[PDB]
Amino acid sequence: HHGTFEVIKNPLDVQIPSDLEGSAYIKVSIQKQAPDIGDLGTVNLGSPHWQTKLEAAQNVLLCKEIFAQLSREAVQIKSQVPHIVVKNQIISQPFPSLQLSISLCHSSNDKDHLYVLEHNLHLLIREFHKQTLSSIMMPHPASAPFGHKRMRLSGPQAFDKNEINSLQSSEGLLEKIIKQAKHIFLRSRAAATIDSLASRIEDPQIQAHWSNINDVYESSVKVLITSQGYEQICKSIQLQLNIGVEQIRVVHRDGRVITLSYQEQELQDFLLSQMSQHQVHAVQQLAKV
Amino acid sequence: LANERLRALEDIEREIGAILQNAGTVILELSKEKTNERLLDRQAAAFTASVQHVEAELSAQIRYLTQVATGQPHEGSSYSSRKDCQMALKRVDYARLKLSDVARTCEQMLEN
Amino acid sequence: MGVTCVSQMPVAEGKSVQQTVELLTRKLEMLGAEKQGTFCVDCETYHTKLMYVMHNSEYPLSCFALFENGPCLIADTNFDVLMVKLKGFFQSAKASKIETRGTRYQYCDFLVKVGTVTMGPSARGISVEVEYGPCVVASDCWSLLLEFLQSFLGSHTPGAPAVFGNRHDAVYGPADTMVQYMELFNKIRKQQQ
Amino acid sequence: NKQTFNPTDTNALVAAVAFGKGLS
Amino acid sequence: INMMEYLLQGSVLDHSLESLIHRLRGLCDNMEPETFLDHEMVFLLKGQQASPFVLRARRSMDRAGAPWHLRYLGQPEMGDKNRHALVRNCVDIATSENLTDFLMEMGFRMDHEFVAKGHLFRKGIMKIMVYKIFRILVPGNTDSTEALSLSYLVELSVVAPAGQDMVSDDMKNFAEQLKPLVHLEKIDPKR
Amino acid sequence: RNQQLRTLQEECDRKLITLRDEISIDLYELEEEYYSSSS
Amino acid sequence: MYNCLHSFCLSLQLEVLHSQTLMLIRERWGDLVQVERYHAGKCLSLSVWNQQVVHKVTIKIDENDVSKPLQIFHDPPLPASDSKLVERAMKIDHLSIEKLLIDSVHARAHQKLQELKAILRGFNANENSSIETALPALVVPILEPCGNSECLHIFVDLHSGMFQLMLYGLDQATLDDMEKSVNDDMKRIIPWIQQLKFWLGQQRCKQSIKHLPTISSETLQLSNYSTHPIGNLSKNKLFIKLTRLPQYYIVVEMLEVPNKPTQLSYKYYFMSVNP
């Protein structure tokens, strides 16, 4: 879409094309009450003024490409748990109790949200724009043709099939956003179960500390069970939990690893079974003292 | 860069100066008492020097354009860095909003 | 990249090649190995001294140029095209094309490849390759390799490949496997029968 | 009206990069 | 398959290079310059036939971790399909860092060396490269360098599979975009 | 234009990183203080 | 006056729709919906779920009783009969085609699922399979008390007809072969859902003894084995090696109760050992 505008003498004035005047923004959201297929109903909504209206039009022209990429990839490429699209919505089911919806909102077309995912969407599409216009492609030796560096290293430093396939990845916009949404959901439920346990039973204490460096796919905690006044003596149960995209990994202070799942009954029974052993180790560590 | 604009507007000044001084000369050569004939020569010299330096500057400018003209649209631009900076500003704004909200809930707990 | 050992299993005084191959594969599947594809190795010789050009299906974007004792090049796939351009200084030395074919098994960071060697249409040998993954220093892990080889071979177990003989702290690389393959191919083309 | 190349240079450089005339 | 290379060459005086660089920045893609620096060697093999075999080998002195590069270029074609650029058969190979020893053991002999320093630009599938040629004496060292002339050399190159018409026309148009400053022509390697 | 925009971006990034570190420190202290009470 | 205006009126609307379909054919949908006839000003017809992966809709006005709006006929394809999903592939008041294209295929899908449910309830009464009405899907249990995992989920995708399956712990190599088999006929689904029932067993066993010093395995490898009594157990059995003290085994054997198809019966055994 050529984006030509035109400028005319009045002190000065501009003329933007139609289809590009208003204000349009994307919106992603997670809920639980499933919606009807009733897609048609409802509607969604000191510098030179030419600066303001020009950049508003550039923003509108950007938000169209993102949704065109997402909506073509919804229908053209197969996945698991398929998708539906009518005009301006995408509806999806990562987990049997997670519905996310993506929606383009525009104001030339009228007759609770996760800001992180909307912010990340622009960066995904811009980093997709870069790699046809960057230094990696240029070849330092004058004789050599154009092409990515690693894929000319792969000749005289004999790479093999795994490295090659790890170097040519074709992953799309919906994939990564679904994955980030999943990890956010799973992390929030793990936090809620730990905190409900901490608030409901007070026979042994339970304490959690979260990490400080974090990613879009993983996270970690340290959980520690101690008695109210004996924190120095009896401290022999301590867990490192590592939360991924749909699993949980648990490492225990004595060389033992378990792998949970995205259901919270498993994790709610694990901690309880450990709070059952704390009391015996507590009596041992005081029978020494 | 800007020097080019400055010289062009100075040339505008000298254009109107040449018109003014020519009008002055022809004031002098109607009055019976045209005594300041040395100064009549002065105003003739003003006419002369003005016209030549004006035409000199414009001819030089045309030659300079004849060495810098190529007839193509010059498709460089600076859009990416501007998107990146706008992203960073709204990230800071998000931060400021969440901070104010925490502030008010702490404010209301400290007060009972 | 990992340490690799290449050897030849004798035909065992009877039967055919297919019977020995299926016995070895049955032992491997009994141990707990699993199929993960196939493989092929070829070689060609060139002369006006002798030059060797080899390809490996494990490294699909490389060509190996070898001398008997000289250096060794790892180029990309275009190298053979360059040979086609020469055509006046190096003959192809026809009737010297040999290949090994088979399937590859993986068992917990090990790679086992048992193949049949063909002089074109006729098969006259069996080759066994065992490669370890996480160790890059030659002879550092030689004990694990010996134990595994004694596990699925019993007798006929080789030992101490000559390429290891440079007793330094050098890093084992993928060009040494090609030296071992060239030596094995020379041995088979010498013995025949 | 100022000149900005020199065809004898062109000849020298081309005949010295297409084989080593002037470098040995 | 086989590939072909189309070439156009010219030169520019070094006291007007800034204007040419500004124009090339304005015409080419929106990418910053590279400023390469390469060592070059030529190997020749003299057999029974009159025409000896010739190969070129390059190395980058600026970026560490770049493999060596071989190149072979055949005789230009006299066919009358494209008549506005040098059309030749090229083969290019990326090679590990023991190329000289293997080439010497095949039978090749080194002939001459030089060092090239300049800038690089891309426009579509067209490669612009503007560089200055140095001279190497006392061949062991690479710091004994003197300039060869008072001018930089300019190359326009396109590499593409065989066939592939209407390419020399676009190269001609791009060359004519630079006519007041540089005059690019087809020139034969002989004198 | 490019140089000015990059300088502004760098300043914003630095401010966010320092804020995150300070909030983490306090966040660590708050959890410890809260998680060790008999309620 | 009314007749002339009504016509022109009923012709501009038709053009609006053809344009939209062509535009959609480029961007998103693409070579999955086709036009088969457009004589201007009178009617058009669209085809969907063609057998190059055969179903048609037609919009049309005709010359009698001018007071009628556009008419849609689903007669050639023949849609399922429900009093909510079928009077909503009728109204064309909203001027958008995709919001009609998807409702037709959605009302076909919500029936293609029901006659799978009928194959199942034929196989076995007293079932508990259920059907979701936000997205068209059927959830079927494999053992009797379970939770939202651990259950096979069957989806139909509106854009291309086919079936899509998932199970949480199942490996990819098996799902893709499940999928083809069931996408040739809707009654090899049964021979496949007694094998998985023997799959969910090993999953409920291994995870139960993971906090203990043991090594689970699905096959031990020992000579004798053809005269000893252990040559007379079933084929769905697990060996549990006790690591702290070697050469001791617990063997668990799973058998199918033949009275009713959603339980198993468990037998525990104790064995020792010295090929």
Question: How close C27 comes to chain A (CA, Å)?
Answer: 27
Beta carbons of A238 and A222 less than 8 angstroms apart: yes
> What is the Cα–Cα distance from A168 to E2, expressed in whole angstroms?
25
Q: Which of E106, A270, G11, B75 is nearest to C83 (CA)?
A: E106
Beta carbons of G177 and G165 less than 8 angstroms apart: no
Q: Do chains F and B touch (3 or more CB pairs under 8 A)?
A: yes
Q: Is G249 helix (H, G, I), strand (E, B) or coil?
A: strand
**Phi-psi domain of A165 (left: phi exceeds 0; alpha: psi -120 through 50; beta: other):** alpha
Determine the straight-line distance between the first and last CA of chain D, rounded to whole angstroms.
38
E53-60 vs E36-45, strand pairing mode:
antiparallel
Tell me, yes or no, if E148 comes closer than 8 A to chain D by beta carbon.
yes
**Residues of G with CB below 8 A from A38's CB?**
none
Question: How close B110 comes to chain F (CA, Å)?
Answer: 15
Interface contact flag, E26 B72, Cβ < 8 Å = yes
For the residues of A54-101, what is the DSSP string, one character each?
A: HHHHHHHHHHHHHHHHHHHHHHHS--SS--EESSSEEEE-SSTT-EEE
> What is the Cα–Cα distance from C116 to C126, expressed in whole angstroms?
5
Q: How far is CA B57 from the centre of its chain?
A: 17
Under DSSP, the state recorded for A175 is H
Q: Is G176 exposed, middle or buried (0-12, 13-18, 19+ CB in 10 A)?
A: exposed
Q: Which of G136, G157, G148 is nearest to G32 (CA)?
A: G157
φ/ψ of residue E179, rounded to 5 = -65, -45
For the residues of A82-148, what is the DSSP string, one character each?
A: --EESSSEEEE-SSTT-EEEEEEE-SSS-----HHHHHHHHHHHHHHHHTTSSGGGS-SSSSS-S--
Resolution value (Å, 1 decimal): 3.7
CA distances from A189 to E87, G33, G150 (A): 67, 42, 20
Nearest to F9 among B78, B88, B95 (CB): B88
φ/ψ of residue E37, rounded to 5 = -160, 115
> What is the Cα–Cα distance from A171 to A168, expressed in whole angstroms?
10
**Residues of A with CB below 8 A from E38's CB?**
140-142
Which helix (DSSP H) or strand (DSSP E) does residue G131 occupy? strand G130-132
**Residues of A with CB below 8 A from F32's CB?**
207, 209
Under DSSP, the state recorded for G229 is G
Which helix (DSSP H) or strand (DSSP E) does residue A250 occupy? strand A248-252
> What is the Cα–Cα distance from E155 to E10, expressed in whole angstroms?
7
- Bridge partners (DSSP) of residue A31 are A99
**Residues of A with CB below 8 A from F38's CB?**
202, 228
Q: Do chains G and B touch (3 or more CB pairs under 8 A)?
A: no
Q: How far is CA E47 from the centre of its chain?
A: 26
**Residues of C with CB below 8 A from A154's CB?**
61
> What is the Cα–Cα distance from E23 to E178, expressed in whole angstroms?
8
Q: Is G160 exposed, middle or buried (0-12, 13-18, 19+ CB in 10 A)?
A: middle
Tell me, yes or no, if E93 comes closer than 8 A to chain C by beta carbon.
yes
> What is the Cα–Cα distance from E66 to E60, expressed in whole angstroms?
7
Beta carbons of C138 and C1 less than 8 angstroms apart: no
Q: Do chains G and D touch (3 or more CB pairs under 8 A)?
A: no
φ/ψ of residue C102, rounded to 5 = 170, -165
> What is the Cα–Cα distance from C52 to C68, expressed in whole angstroms?
9
Q: In terms of CA atoms, which chain G residue is nearest residue A72? A: G28
Nearest to E69 among A144, A153, A157 (CB): A144
Q: Is C84 exposed, middle or buried (0-12, 13-18, 19+ CB in 10 A)?
A: exposed
> What is the Cα–Cα distance from A287 to A189, expressed in whole angstroms?
39
Beta carbons of G25 and G17 less than 8 angstroms apart: no
> What is the Cα–Cα distance from E65 to E87, expressed in whole angstroms?
32
Q: Which of A36, A35, A66, A75 is nearest to A177 (CA)?
A: A66
Determine the straight-line distance between the first and last CA of chain E, rounded to whole angstroms.
32
> What is the Cα–Cα distance from G97 to A87, expressed in whole angstroms?
10
Interface contact flag, A155 C174, Cβ < 8 Å = no
φ/ψ of residue B59, rounded to 5 = -65, -40
Interface contact flag, B70 E25, Cβ < 8 Å = no
Beta carbons of C82 and E89 less than 8 angstroms apart: no
CA angle E120–E123–E124, rounded 5-degree value = 135
Nearest to B76 among E23, E26, E177 (CB): E26
Q: Is C9 helix (H, G, I), strand (E, B) or coil?
A: coil
The dihedral built from the CA positions of residue E8, E14, E20 and E24, taken in this order, carries a sign that is positive
Touching subunits of B (3+ CB pairs, under 8 Å) are A, E, F
E36-45 vs A12-15, strand pairing mode:
unpaired
φ/ψ of residue E50, rounded to 5 = -65, -40
Interface contact flag, E67 A155, Cβ < 8 Å = yes
Q: Which of A148, A158, C65, C165 is nearest to E98 (CA)?
A: C65
Which helix (DSSP H) or strand (DSSP E) does residue A28 occupy? strand A25-31
**Residues of C with CB below 8 A from A160's CB?**
58-60
Interface contact flag, A135 E32, Cβ < 8 Å = yes
Angle, to 10 degrees, between the axis of helix B80-109 and the axis of helix F2-34? Answer: 30
Question: How close E31 comes to chain A (CA, Å)?
Answer: 7
Write out chain E in H/E/C secondary structure.
Answer: CCEEEEEEEEEEECCCHHHHHHHHHHHCCCCCCCCEEEEEEEEEECCCCCCCEEEEEEEECCCCCCCEEEEEECCCCCCCCCCCCEEEEEEEEEECCCHHHHHHHHCCEEEEEEEEEEEEEEECCEEEEEEEEEEECCCCCCCCEEECCCEEEEEEEEEEECCCCCCHHHHHHHHHCCCCCCCCECCCCCC
- Bridge partners (DSSP) of residue A147 are none
Q: Is C91 helix (H, G, I), strand (E, B) or coil?
A: strand
Beta carbons of C114 and C24 less than 8 angstroms apart: yes
Q: Which of E64, E153, E69 is nearest to A143 (CA)?
A: E69
How many separate helices (H) and strands (E) can be counted in chain G?
5, 12
Question: How close A155 comes to chain E (CA, Å)?
Answer: 7
Q: Which of E3, E4, E13, E6 is nearest to E127 (CA)?
A: E6
Question: How close E40 comes to chain A (CA, Å)?
Answer: 10
**Residues of E with CB below 8 A from B67's CB?**
19, 180
Interface contact flag, G32 A87, Cβ < 8 Å = no
For residue G229, give the amino acid letter: P
Structural domain boundaries in chain E: 3-177
Tell me, yes or no, if A226 comes closer than 8 A to chain G by beta carbon.
no
CA distances from A231 to A204, A227, A282, A287 (A): 11, 6, 10, 16
Nearest to B72 among E19, E27, E30 (CB): E27
Question: Token pair 């252990």 is at which residue?
Answer: G230
> What is the Cα–Cα distance from C61 to C57, expressed in whole angstroms?
9
> What is the Cα–Cα distance from E173 to E123, expressed in whole angstroms?
13
Under DSSP, the state recorded for C80 is H
The dihedral built from the CA positions of residue G59, G61, G67 and G68, taken in this order, carries a sign that is negative
> What is the Cα–Cα distance from B55 to B11, expressed in whole angstroms?
10
E3-177 classified as CATH 3.40.50.300: no
Size of interface A-F (CB pairs under 8 A): 21
**Residues of F with CB below 8 A from A205's CB?**
35-36
Nearest to A160 among C58, C75, C77 (CB): C58
Question: Token pair 């006299």 is at which residue?
Answer: E78
How much helix, strand and coil, in percent to the nearest 5, is found in chain B?
A: 80, 0, 20
Q: How far is CA A235 from the centre of its chain?
A: 36
> What is the Cα–Cα distance from A53 to E150, expressed in whole angstroms?
52
> What is the Cα–Cα distance from G102 to G158, expressed in whole angstroms?
7
CA distances from A18 to A108, B83, G15 (A): 10, 23, 22
**Residue G197: how many CB atoms within 10 A of its CB?**
19
